[PDB]
Amino acid sequence: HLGKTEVFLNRFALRPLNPEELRPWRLEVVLDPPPGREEVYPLLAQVARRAGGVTVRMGDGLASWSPPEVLVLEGTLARMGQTYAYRLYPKGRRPLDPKDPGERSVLSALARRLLQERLRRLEGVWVEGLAVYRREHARGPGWRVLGGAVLDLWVSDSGAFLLEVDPAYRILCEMSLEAWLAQGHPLPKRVRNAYDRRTWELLRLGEEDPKEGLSLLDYHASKGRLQGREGGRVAWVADPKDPRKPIPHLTGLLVPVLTLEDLSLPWEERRRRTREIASWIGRRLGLGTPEAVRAQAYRLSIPKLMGRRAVSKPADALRVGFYRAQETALALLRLDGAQGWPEFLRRALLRAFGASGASLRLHTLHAHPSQGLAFREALRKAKEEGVQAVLVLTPPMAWEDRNRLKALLLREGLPSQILNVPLREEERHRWENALLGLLAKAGLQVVALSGAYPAELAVGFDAGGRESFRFGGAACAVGGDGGHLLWTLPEAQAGERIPQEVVWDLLEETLWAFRRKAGRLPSRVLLLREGRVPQDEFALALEALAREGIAYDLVSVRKSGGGRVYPVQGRLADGLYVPLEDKTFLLLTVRGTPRPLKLVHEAGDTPLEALAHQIFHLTRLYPASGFAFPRLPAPLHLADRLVKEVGRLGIRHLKEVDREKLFFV
DNA sequence: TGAGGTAGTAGGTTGT
RNA sequence: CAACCUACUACCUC
Ligand SMILES: [Mg+2]
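# magnesium ion complex -> structure
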């Protein structure tokens, strides 16, 4: 429990809502064709937009801060694809209270609309959504870069206004598709139809004749889409989604959409540009003078991290020794021309295993994957002589090969860590992270936490995989007393939402893992989800925990939405806790401007401080980080990576991989 | 594939 | 319409 500190957030307080904004006008709606089922809301919101003025939806009909008489109370609209005649009917005004969150919800919405709408008419200003740009930063040959900020406006509990502000840049081009080539520019990886709004991943060009299943130049004009311009026919792109077959379209009806290559704010300058814009907006909108909102920060007890002895970053366990070594064999695979183990790597590993008192063996695989099945027999044999993981020296592999090889070894129970081939002793940070990764893949506890924490078990949950279906998975850190890191077999699912039965099952695996290292159940576990928790996702798992008499806390850990945190005076410390609302706090562990982790206590009865403590500390357990800690707790960072990697290479291989070998780092 | 991060550019899922 | 998440790319950092 370290020392206080005062900080201000990237929010500001503005003028109290006025007697007229506290009593919104109410209006019912009437659509014809009469509304559907789940089509009502995505549309009742779109009618607030069409109606005009500052109006947002409020129940079955919308609310408005503008009088009905200055609204388009009747008009026409088209939705999913139908002409819907509408008519707004007035039904008096109904006051709202900031204290009553349900209603304060609406005020904040009107407030967000007021924000845009007022911005919409500031001459000399581009409003792309709730974000605004008000300074040019640089230019080129039709390629201009706008400065500005993204912002939100909501209502406080004291019936006052709140404005969140954060600097941003924009990239904008003028020249058409072929008009961008008139500049001599290179092939924009992406583009977007002016006529439509679709973004095509431009593939290449072609001398192919336009007049030459469909007739290009001809049918293109059939939609009367030949007017306005034409230029060089050029590209025959492909749907970014189904990105194979070629579906060509005229390069007169595409607008070039530029990117980074085809400018980084120092926090000191961001805290400046933030206050500037804040003032500016309150001034230009009659919202008043911006009072920077400030909150109490807290410095958090630095973690005591333990190799064989105390250590400050995982890499140092390389010279001190490991929190827990064991007899370990490690094989080598060379996909370049060379034969033996680079001596400095040989030395480096001995020096570390010496220091630990544990015994090492350094095998070599004399085989190439080119051999086919005979190569798998080579693996079968090394795994037989007790190799636990392999290092692979190789020039940069391609994704498709890289995956195939990784997946191959895992089929023989062998985790692999690639180290790319042009390699020199001085590239020390490279190969030491490669070494840590190899040892983690071998099953070794590199470092752990000395300390006492509320929960002896910490499990992270994530879901992911590019494809049509996802995986839901869990990693975990066993025993408060440092950690033992484990992964569990993920399970395939339709969406991001992990199924309840599945959450509990993965959870139960973590529990059982704990039971088998300490002959007892854990008294309390710490549950970590990445991002918003899908409502009720942990329903069963929590009830199940209860009936087993295990204490719990669920925390939602978000990487986005933490906003910004600035020092009132001085420099900010690495480990800062910052309670916000109720049940929600930030955590900052940072040559740019940092993003705080936003954390939400979704369940359980534990001091936000206590949780922030563990969490921040788990940040240090990640064994392949090396010379830098991940922003997220080791057990969550792991679940994130495992789920990604089972995504990349499929679940069928992991049958025979020891759950203590972190193969995915 | 060494790894942590932020920052531009795309975009998908959950949810009322 | 919010709240999160993803992928590229470019930079930094050890
Ligand atoms: Mg790795």
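# post-check
Residues A 437, 665 surround magnesium ion (CB under 6 Å).
Chain A has five domains: 1-18+95-175+259-299+564-568, 19-94, 176-258, 300-303+451-563+569-665, 304-450.
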